[PDB]
Structure 1
């Protein structure tokens, strides 16, 4: 089926300023969206802010401000950050949006009409910081900000608190068998595989019913009212998850403002998500609660949930109070936006908690972006080697020539597979493996010497080198969007060949194509010293 490729990020709590974690998650969403756009697909990428709940209301109280003003201010900060980070997100959703509120009420009514919501009680532990219900097996002893003994979440280390409330309960226990069918029938639906195995293990053990409302006072009346019961508010998580559905139903003008909410999601062809990008910390809400809500409501389920890991800087926790900060905008100005994005995406895969350091960052910038890629682009466009500033016409290919051509021809199918898992690190490694091959070929062929010795040979070497560099760059373009444009300009690749599966094929740019003009002092990636 042909539809809009729908990729999302989590909507982030606005209790504090945006930091690296939100940027990282949103980057992954951006990259996937971008790759499907260069395949020539329709895309809708979604990100946003999670603005209701006790957590946010209480953060607003701490700063001595009204929830409306606090959420608007912090949401403003997320937008500014994401704009500065230079993503290509199609819409930024806020759970305070009035159309979102309408969608939450529609979904609730469906759950109720289906018979999957009843009035009951939650008596148990709750982590406000995580907005998460927890069993006694999931808490332990710890310390609050006073130094006193308290209970904390095993998941997250945050303070937990005992709740005893009459709440509307969702019949999650009734969806065990159906969720297990779903996992088994779609063994790629959760990524990476070991997180998929965790989810099944958890659901195998059995599911309790889930509280989907809270008494209004507990939430400082900062939440969406339960339809038909003004004393209750909708669980912030049921509210939050619903953003994906809301997003799928919004018509958005060229300014990026929501202008209309459609009744039937099919009308816009986005729902359900092809990929939900999340962090490991919020796996249960997306891989258990969400599909259960959807199954109850008769809505289609998402194709993939991909959950990545947490970050560190110099093998330590990131916090201002702890004295270990990683500001993404600061680091992008110091090293470059595309370079920083490359590093975040190259340095760690989802199974790992990665490690930034200025040292390792400089090693990758110098090693991979400058020595491997940048080097290659300058060689194949150099006045010295490419003396006519054009894509030459190749002569006959040797076996060594053909081995390289083969690697290049195979590259898109391989990189495509990795992007679809999705596993962005593996795609980058695949493209750079081919780049390393091209460098070894060039070294082997010594085109600087061929300029004088054998110009007919130089034509073949140069043509393959240019074509390798174009194809690698096209595949790296979701990761280095600005630099890929520079590279293409230097190579003189026409606009039409910069996008589309058609241009994944070897030889899509004809010989005789002129290179772009050169600048006396220009470099794609400039090396950094080692102090």
Structure 2
């Protein structure tokens, strides 16, 4: 009964709230988290990569959510793992069990409350958190209407966890990232926290509170438990839960950080459940002077868009999109620096070395320096990925590709091809081998960012599909390997 060997890694994308519809607006988040998951799969991890998502209006919306999810997954090549339907997941047993544990811990109480309530956010707001935009009172943070409501509601004793949360932040400095987001959460919690309304009296459809069917949970309370549902909760003895909980990484947008970094860990502390290891809040994309990567991918190519978004924007910051910025990356970074270097060297293998990887001679100093830089990339890229700094990992790879192109232009293997010498031909073989070998290493490491284009390059280098994990980075290109006739992988931008 051994169906797994590698260390597990459980990573989630964000719940939909405050949007009723999942997936929409999450393409950037999905591309980034997919690259993280693909990197972990290539680095000998058992990856579990899941979404944070689970009358007549509600059901057709379920078809649209499905259609949007399939299109986004296929257009951007997201490799979410397949979740198995269970009876507990259909009946919201996770949030009901979480409620039971928090109630049994003494952290849930009924009370009367009056204040500004937002139907869309399902939250209460204080006076300073509202504003009259134009004779209509809206929330300052989200812009949703509020009306004054006097309700009976169940509260979570969030105030009893202010210091416990600050102690968790101090003991786990990598729990919240990037650092500007960590400083903001610490500043917020340090000001003190009030108790948190978590239910409403309603007969509308929703997750009924255990023992109190006249109350229903707010949508975001039950939504957060989807992370636990993804690991088989409330079946804490199940193999799924022992293996994958706690989650290693919650990937979210910075708009819902307080739900994940304050409310969520307090809920889990109250219920006696292990907390997630890390929360990373990314920024949002805007046009220069909203950005739809699915439409960009269909127009420009999936790997061009995935590369641009993960390279142009330092992950965590807000990003600016201009057509000029992505055209340069498509034409310079991809088509020229990587594509043309691979095409030039592979063309000489096919035409002058009978389509066979040459056996290199003894490596000169210039050969060893370039190989040493490439051999050191896996360690540097792994460190950047562990901090969710994919832009720095891609910059490191293209810095090596810069050295490789410089090396290629200095060695001039296309002029050594002519000479009938014994030393020029040996130098011809060695320089082509070194260029192919560093292209192989770069192609292996860009698989998380551009899976198909990297796969095509590895096909051109005669690498079987079984020899494409990061363990293969330390195994040099085999002389005598037969290479297929080279074809283009990274085309130049074609204006409409």
| TM-score, with length taken from structure 2 | 0.91
Give the Å deviation of 1:18: 4.9
Segment of structure 1 superposing worse, 27-36 or 80-89: 80-89
- Change in Cα spacing, 1:100 to 1:372, as seen in structure 2 (3 Å) is farther
Q: Does the CA contact (< 8 Å) of 1:394 and 1:459 recur in 2?
A: yes
Distance 2:308 2:139 in 1: 32
- Change in Cα spacing, 1:89 to 1:204, as seen in structure 2 (3 Å) is same
Distance 1:205 1:471 in 2: 50
After TM superposition, the structure 1 = structure 2 runs for residues 316-327 of structure 1, keeping only pairs within 5 Å, are 318=290, 326-327=291-292
Picking from 112, 116, 119, the partner of 1:125 is: 116
Give the Å deviation of 1:248: 0.7
Q: Does the CA contact (< 8 Å) of 2:15 and 2:22 recur in 1?
A: no
- Change in Cα spacing, 1:195 to 1:327, as seen in structure 2 (3 Å) is closer
After TM superposition, the structure 1 = structure 2 runs for residues 419-498 of structure 1, keeping only pairs within 5 Å, are 419-453=385-419, 454-498=424-468
Distance 1:421 1:304 in 2: 10
Runs of at least 5 residues in structure 1 that lack an aligned partner in the other structure: 51-64, 144-148, 251-260, 319-325
After TM superposition, the structure 1 = structure 2 runs for residues 373-452 of structure 1, keeping only pairs within 5 Å, are 373-383=338-348, 387-452=353-418
Aligned to 2:224: 241
Question: Is 1:514 equivalent to 2:479 in the alignment?
Answer: no
Give the Å deviation of 1:390: 2.3
Give the Å deviation of 1:141: 3.0
Picking from 227, 237, 240, the partner of 1:264 is: 237
Picking from 163, 168, 180, the partner of 2:154 is: 168
SS of the aligned residue for 1:478 comes to coil
Runs of at least 5 residues in structure 2 that lack an aligned partner in the other structure: none
- Change in Cα spacing, 1:447 to 1:203, as seen in structure 2 (3 Å) is same
Q: Does the CA contact (< 8 Å) of 2:14 and 2:252 recur in 1?
A: yes
Aligned to 1:43: 47
Q: Does the CA contact (< 8 Å) of 2:287 and 2:322 recur in 1?
A: yes
Question: Is 1:114 equivalent to 2:105 in the alignment?
Answer: yes
Give the Å deviation of 1:67: 4.0
Give the Å deviation of 1:203: 0.8
Give the Å deviation of 1:17: 8.0
Distance 1:192 1:201 in 2: 15
Q: Does the CA contact (< 8 Å) of 1:48 and 1:94 recur in 2?
A: no
Aligned to 2:293: 328
Distance 1:224 1:405 in 2: 59
Give the Å deviation of 1:127: 3.8
Q: Does the CA contact (< 8 Å) of 2:107 and 2:270 recur in 1?
A: yes
Q: Does the CA contact (< 8 Å) of 1:365 and 1:527 recur in 2?
A: yes
Q: Does the CA contact (< 8 Å) of 2:88 and 2:94 recur in 1?
A: no
Distance 2:139 2:428 in 1: 65
Question: Is 1:79 equivalent to 2:52 in the alignment?
Answer: no
| TM-score, with length taken from structure 1 | 0.85
Distance 1:437 1:294 in 2: 49
Aligned length: 484
Provide, for residues 478-515 of structure 1, a one-character-per-residue CA deviation record: whole Å limited to 9, x for no partner.
1111111111110101223201x42232x433222221
Aligned to 2:471: 502
After TM superposition, the structure 1 = structure 2 runs for residues 286-301 of structure 1, keeping only pairs within 5 Å, are 286-301=260-275
Question: Is 1:150 equivalent to 2:150 in the alignment?
Answer: no
SS of the aligned residue for 1:11 comes to coil
Question: Aligned-residue CA RMSD in angstroms?
Answer: 2.4
Give the Å deviation of 1:109: 0.6
Aligned to 1:322: none
